[PDB]
């Protein structure tokens, strides 16, 4: 659970 | 309502300092955040509040209520998953 295949950018 | 998905980083506050705002509206099963210049707002409800813990995004709140004007200066009030995971965890078992 919880670790995107596409990593979020902030 | 925007067509594409939005995001915002925001800090969690103690319930206690929250009470400063909502007074006696804030219940143990509720968790605050914002007043950072960002605000959750109508249509965002039911949605995710995540924190990074040990590599992964973990459900920490569920957008519930706050300001009717979505004032970026007042904190939004989220469901506190910590307090309801036992019930979720449970519902999963019987179905």
């Amino acid at each position: 659970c919880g670790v995107p295949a596409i990593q979020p950018v902030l | 309502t925007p067509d594409r998905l939005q995001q915002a980083s925001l800090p969690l506050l103690s319930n206690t300092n929250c009470k400063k705002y909502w007074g006696t509206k804030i219940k143990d099963a509720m968790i605050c955040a914002g007043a950072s210049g960002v605000s959750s707002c109508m249509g965002d409800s039911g949605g995710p509040l995540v924190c990074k813990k040990n590599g992964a995004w973990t459900l920490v709140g569920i957008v519930s209520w706050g300001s009717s004007t979505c004032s970026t200066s007042t904190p939004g009030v989220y469901a506190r998953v910590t307090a309801l995971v036992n019930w979720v965890q449970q519902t999963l078992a019987a179905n």
């Binding site: 659970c1 995107p4 | 309502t1 594409r4 939005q6 995001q7 965002d44 409800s45 920490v60 309801l84």
Partner: protein, 131 residues
Amino acid sequence: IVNGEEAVPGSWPWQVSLQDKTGFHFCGGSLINENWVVTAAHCGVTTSDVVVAGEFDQGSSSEKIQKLKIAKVFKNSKYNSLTINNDITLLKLSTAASFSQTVSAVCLPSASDDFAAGTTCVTTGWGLTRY
């Protein structure tokens, strides 16, 4: 979100959108695994509603999204409408979500989990961006 920025697409794979039979988005939701969505109890979700996943642009037609049907709604019985205290409704899916590069589960904390005031976290959705 007043003041949020647009997300990178598929960067938030457990975000789902609740829409009516009209197509109108009215609440968000988070995938907890392939048959179970978490949302708010006040959202008042029924089974004429649908779970949409793998969506980025509400307005784009060329998206490989998943329209998922609700089987059963589970309003937490401690939910208080007078207070909007314990505002958690599980959603049981009639149709399994197909996990992928863009559809996946967030993690649940332990009842034990600590998450300290001052800690910077993230909220997503399709809510009013100006009120």
